[PDB]
Amino acid sequence: HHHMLKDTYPYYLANEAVYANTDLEVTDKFSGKVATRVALADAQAIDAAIGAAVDAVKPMRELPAYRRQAVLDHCVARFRERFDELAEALCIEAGKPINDSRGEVTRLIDTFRVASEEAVRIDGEVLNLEISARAQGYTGYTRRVPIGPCSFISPFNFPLNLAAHKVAPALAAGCPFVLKPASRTPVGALIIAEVLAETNLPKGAFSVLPAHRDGADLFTTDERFRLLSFTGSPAVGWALKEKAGKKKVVLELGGNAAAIVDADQFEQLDYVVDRLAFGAYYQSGQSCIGVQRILVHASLYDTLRDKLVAKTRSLKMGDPKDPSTFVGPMISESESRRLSGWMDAAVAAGAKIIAGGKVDGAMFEATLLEDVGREQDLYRKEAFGPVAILEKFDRFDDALARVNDSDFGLQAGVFTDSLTHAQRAWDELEVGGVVINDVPSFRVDNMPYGGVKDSGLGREGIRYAIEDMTEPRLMVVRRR
Amino acid sequence: LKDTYPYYLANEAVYANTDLEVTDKFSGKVATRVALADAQAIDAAIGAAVDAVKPMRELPAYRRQAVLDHCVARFRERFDELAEALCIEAGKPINDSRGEVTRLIDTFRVASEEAVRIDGEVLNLEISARAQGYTGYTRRVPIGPCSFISPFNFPLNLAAHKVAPALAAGCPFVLKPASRTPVGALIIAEVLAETNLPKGAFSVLPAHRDGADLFTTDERFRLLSFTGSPAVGWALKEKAGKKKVVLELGGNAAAIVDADQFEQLDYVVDRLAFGAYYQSGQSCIGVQRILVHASLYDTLRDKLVAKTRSLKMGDPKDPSTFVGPMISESESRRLSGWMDAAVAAGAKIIAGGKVDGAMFEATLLEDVGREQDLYRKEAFGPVAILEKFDRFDDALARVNDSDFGLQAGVFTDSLTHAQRAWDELEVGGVVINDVPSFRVDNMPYGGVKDSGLGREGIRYAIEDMTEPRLMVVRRR
């Protein structure tokens, strides 16, 4: 350990640091103390950033692929150099257990490395257009042109890697961008910005501007932005789509992800239980694909329940700086009170707490319930905390229907060795991604990732983000 | 035309009323009457589309293909009927109407081919030790019920660019054609009704814009795909709610004639006259602005004035007619007013200029200021403007001097200039050695800036009408 968190941070306006004020206090989410103060961007700074992004469109578009790759490679190298600094910043400002903070910094590097690879292979097509006599002598050629200035909004819980899934493809694609990180967790994004400020990018290629939601209207409504890409809560995301105007909108939202445990899993129950506990309680359940609902075949239910109760009770809660901590604080006392209120309501309606259940401020222990009615808020809304619900099924198709019994559809997991059941799940689960033999909580950063129903609109993963951040431009050549 | 047409509700002909009168756009007389859908019928169609989602999703690729092949065969069989219906209800010259029916067949044939090759990917996910043992598999799943809205000017082929990919992708859909030209869509519906598609796979429902709110707002639709005016399309995007939105809109397309074109001027002029005046300029990629290098401007002008004056205006049923009626006297009046204002501000009519009701002759102007409505707004009529340039980059800048960006054309033999145009023209498509008005129905097609959001062409519409669904398999 060597402490590198600064007492103050600037924001980044058109690639350069501005120590405009110290008005945004960032707390340590475990101690509650102010850990650092960062510059808060007002609407004039946001407007200036957008104008600079417009001016950077042509210089960014003209940057050759290998230069964009070199920028991304510089980031990769510097993130590796500053690995412990990034991990500690994440631990402090998100209250994220240090082991898992280190894991997210590894993902940040992974995401930029995928972007570095994809930056030099944004290919096009030579299209046969001679499909009829009228088109004799015509040929098509395609390319992907950067869409223009992009507006990026990211959430508190994976602040490094979810910013990376917008920033890194934008650089690969050649788009200027303005990123607004979560005000509770801005420091990681500002370290990313400091690293980018070391590169030769054209001025206006990027701004990173902390701003509260109530001062952030221009990120959605300014017509100079050609894309809004938002990662955050469904309630916010769908509201911003309505206000976005002409720009393209990409939404990465939330859900109440389910895992199914099939009848053939007896011999690997310890593996299953370990992955269920990871998915339900990693980062205290503050994951957009955290396991919230667990559907277990009746033949295995009692044995799995005993094992999962024991595993859940074994998880260490406490200071996220402690490398033995698995369950750190929830992001605020108000979020803990929201979830504990839903838990109380489920219990009042007949549910039973079978592991955990103690809440002390933002310290919510890993908690497991059964007999939760499907009508309950704890069942149907996004828990976003260290609570999971255990339920029983007989017929695989009933398990699938109950996974789908939701407003949401981000990912689902199925522990099965049956080809028939895996195929049926792929056919029938209305989700962005179906995970076989692991929890829905799995993501690798090159894969297409996103939700359907109320959980999203579009996909991230570097290739898919590049597609959204570019416009195809066809050239038709006529030969006579 | 038949005396009356039904609408199609969940694959079924319903003779609900005869309330929508469709006029012959040349004679002005009522040519047919068709059933007008009310909100109850639209709601029932949407509910039926929801119930058809699973049966459509389960329809095998080769059966979706067979449905598309049946349409192709019947459109060939009914070619003259379709072309004459187009001629009547759109006032479209019969030669151009036949051209559109040929394209209707082309569009469905591309869809037939694409229906059986909606492939996915086996993705390497082992990019780090954490992901050892994981593999990805992808497929495209139908997005769900689709809402389709189409315009008056290509009533068969632009409906086809939504209907045919929806069938290939496995989506139920509800199509609202233009009230001025609904018969083509209703003949497409009649042919689809012959097939064994599951009930609720399709509805085709005439409705006026003021009775069509549910096509935009109903949350059971997962996609709205709109083809029509920019003013309407951007307004509907604001009201669509959660659904995906695809927009195919309009523009003021330009053609550049480079300094190396002197020996090809007769070809260039023929294509300019085609692009500016085909279907009386009622094309979303009609040539509206012509930028010509100063070195050959005067020769091109003489030839283009002569060509424009040679174009025959009159009854669209006459095969010799090139310029038929505009869609209404009010649209002709709108364009004539813009022309008058440009002349009042200093422009000069150098060919044509006579307007009589909806009969607007092929017209060419010079000295149109770039601030004029005739320059900047979508003319959608048989008027083109001619202007001069010296430097190629100035021509490119002036093409881009617009709210719009659908397609642009560049007549050049210079690799350097073609490459520069591809780099710099902010449009969906750049056409080299033909006008921007060229489209072949498999190509990616659409606009940027105020001209659109997304692409049509069968492959690209299938992408919008499906959701990727990843399956990650972990081996331990």
Added chain:
Amino acid sequence: LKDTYPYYLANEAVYANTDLEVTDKFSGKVATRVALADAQAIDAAIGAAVDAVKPMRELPAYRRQAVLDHCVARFRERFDELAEALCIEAGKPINDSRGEVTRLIDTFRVASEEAVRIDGEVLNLEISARAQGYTGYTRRVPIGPCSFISPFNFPLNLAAHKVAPALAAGCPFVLKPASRTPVGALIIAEVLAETNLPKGAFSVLPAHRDGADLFTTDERFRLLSFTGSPAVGWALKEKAGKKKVVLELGGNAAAIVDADQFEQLDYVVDRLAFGAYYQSGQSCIGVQRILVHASLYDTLRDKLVAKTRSLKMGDPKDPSTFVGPMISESESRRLSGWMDAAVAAGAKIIAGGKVDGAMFEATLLEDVGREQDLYRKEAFGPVAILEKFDRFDDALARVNDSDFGLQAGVFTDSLTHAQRAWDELEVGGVVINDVPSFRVDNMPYGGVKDSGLGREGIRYAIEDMTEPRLMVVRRR
């Protein structure tokens, strides 16, 4: 059958002689006589193919498609003629002959679709400062004249897998069908002669192997694509010279029945009988070896013995015949000799076993030693061997215990076992939940080890029948 057939030399029928007698493979009587091409005719065909290279290359994609579509339509109209000819000259049961004609049509249909989507790539080449300003563009150019050799058992469809992609790719070709079954190829040629292909686009020339050296050695062919026995194919590769060589050969295909299959044994047994005995085992992916988990062996054995005994042997013109004659008495003698040797070494015939001329009953043995010719060589007749395993990995190793590697089948519901089989089976294709005998005509298809070199299936044949041609453009 007509009394005589011509051969086709540079698109035209030539009734050169009646020197090749084609027998009815069930009655033994001469059914027709066809013209036999000598080396002078083969040489002339090659020269004509060279002269047709440029006109074939300049044929637009939609014209190549139209040629293929004409074949599809005419094969449909001549369906019964084609099936009856195949039934007579191959002794193929009429139901399976009709099934092959359907495949012939489907193979040409896939080629028709692919003919208009032979796309290329726009490649980013700016991977370093040295390559700043360079871009790559690719296309596929026809490779040139192609030499095609096809076998007796699927004479229509295996010719189609060379002819149809050649037409889609723009290659002139010269096809030598099997002398035992040349008529189907000559009907295909007659249909092609109705199209307006440039003269020299195709020749179809019956010739015996000992008069066929030019098909391998002539340097004017740029590709030899051979479907036939491994002994011949590997020997032709050695003699081919500079040309590209594609080989589609044979094997001793295996099916594994996993421990989880008890509830679907009737399905498994039905597919095993189909794969082992369809066309009397005269299939390059016929089931020859059946490995069954010990826990299910006795139940499957009883069901498979009963199923095998139920198969009707006899006249292939009878639609109830499943087991028709083998292609000749000499081939029946070959297989009967291997069967006798296996029994002498301890094997047991548990169903069938009677041989009378070319009429070889559907036959099942157990206790066949892995050293036996019946185990290790290509049976190509209505014999299958049944063996037992305990460990899934042992089953996989025993599938691989072979010179060959075309396809293998695994009946399993285990993801773990399906994945392991995909990892470990050294074959071109692994079929899960069906026999190795399955093929659909768009899929990549071929062998590794001694079973082949390269892949057919339309897309993959087009790749072999074309050369990529890169255009690098430098901007500075």
Added chain:
Amino acid sequence: LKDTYPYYLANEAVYANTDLEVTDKFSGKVATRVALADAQAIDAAIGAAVDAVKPMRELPAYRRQAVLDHCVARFRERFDELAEALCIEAGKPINDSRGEVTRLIDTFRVASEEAVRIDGEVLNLEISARAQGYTGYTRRVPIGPCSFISPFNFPLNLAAHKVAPALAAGCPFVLKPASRTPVGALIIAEVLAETNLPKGAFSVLPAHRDGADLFTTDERFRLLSFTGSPAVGWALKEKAGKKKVVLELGGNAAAIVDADQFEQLDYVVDRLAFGAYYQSGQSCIGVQRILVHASLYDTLRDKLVAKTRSLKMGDPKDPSTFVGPMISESESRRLSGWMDAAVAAGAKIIAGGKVDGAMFEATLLEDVGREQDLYRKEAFGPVAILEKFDRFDDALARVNDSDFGLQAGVFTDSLTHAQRAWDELEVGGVVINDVPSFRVDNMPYGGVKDSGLGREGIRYAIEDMTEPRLMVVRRR
């Protein structure tokens, strides 16, 4: 250079002997001595490769990438050592030796990128009712042990174009470098020996052609990939047996200068001189023939004569040297004999023309008859021929007037002419606005006609070093 180098047998350095002397190609003195592999060592290497097939196949993609990344990092650290070794053993001017080390790194970097994206396809197989319920999944499986042979002139980068894709694809390989230039390959081997690759993943074995039969004939190799002279490559294809063969050979590359190039002549002349005389013309895409439009022939000739005469010849250790020694006096004598014959038949030397041992001046000739050896065979030395044309199609015909077809270059700004050249030049690659001598290491690269069979460039080499393995899954 070190005093001695070992060879690498199954990943390990073996100082077996010092029997292969490597000379400094400028001084002629022995610069180092390396271990020469005999048949026993080659056979041991092949057996070890066979044993490494399964461990190499099971290496996860990210581990193969890490191996490649280790190579990139160490090549950067050892950049000067690699460049000096190449300068000495090939006589390659130090500036250009440094350039080839940069290419070595670039080639491994492309391979590192491609190693983690060897994706497959999820194929729709439901193209007919018979195939209802079937789906296809593909993967690329390493082909097995690969035999690699590389030439003297780009010994680092051409070894890299085999070694790096083999590692990305998961194939064990045995590489035989050119005996005249083995040190660079042995440094690559030393770096690979630092990685944790399974034993038998690689061997690098110097051996003379007369002791190298097993590299072509041993049946345990599944692929021979040969880069070298056409006379050798086509001969090895005849002897290869069943294995797949890939050939990267030579040619007599041409550059066309079109009529529109007057304002660019200094750029054109600089690139022509570079392409003709880089590494003293010892390049498989060196410019040998220069076709110039009559309208600017005299001006180009004057400029190219002056540029050619300005090139500095001498010690390749001097950074100012561009024309170093040819690889041997025997090769110099070969080319000077062809030059003498051309002059005796009427050609004129207009620049250079003098030869002193292996020091052959940059030399330009006119009036070389198309029949001459200097015109038609591969010069592989610092000689270029200048000729005149009036019609672009005639220039294209004359480029094609050759046994060869690797790459051609065309300096033109005409879209029409660039398209015609892409249509008509029978070469692997057409370069627009640069010489045929351009290559970037990700692009598809290779020859047609006598110049090659197949393509290198990382993606394309991976395709040849893998077999597709289809998994068909049936759902009922």
